[PDB]
Symmetry: C2
Subunit: 83 residues, 2 copies
């Protein structure tokens, strides 16, 4: 299924870099904003991504809000908008 | 259900004007350039997208725009902030 991670930071580009690096290790790529998606893997993979983030000592003081969710009915409106 | 709109722009700026149109159909910016509405249906999302479409300049200045349903919305803030 399609899993997604979205967050709010308080820190910038470096933190976004280091978080993106941890998430890339589990197939989560920045798609549209501060939204990281993985269209392939399951919940165990999402949970390993979230454990890997926890490991980063500084993330608890830089992340205000972090959401993970399943995306369904992923739909492209780019053409619907470009007329 | 929970619906969301995510986009990539090229040219806070006109995030204001898109956000204003989307706020009219209950879509609020929640986490980045991600606008969410927990409440309404596909018809509401549809007229939100028509409302964007009518903006003259949005064709030049949107590269990618997705809409989708969110399920299993989960809060990992406590999970992380330990």
């Amino acid at each position: 299924a399609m899993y997604a991670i979205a967050f709010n930071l308080v820190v910038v580009q470096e933190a976004y870099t280091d978080i993106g690096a941890v998430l890339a290790k589990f197939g989560f790529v920045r798609t549209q904003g501060s939204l990281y998606t993985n269209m392939n893997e399951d919940m165990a993979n999402l949970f390993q991504a979230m454990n890997a983030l926890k490991q980063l000592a500084w993330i608890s003081q830089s992340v205000r809000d972090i959401r993970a969710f399943r995306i369904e009915q992923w739909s492209d409106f780019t053409d619907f908008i470009r007329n």
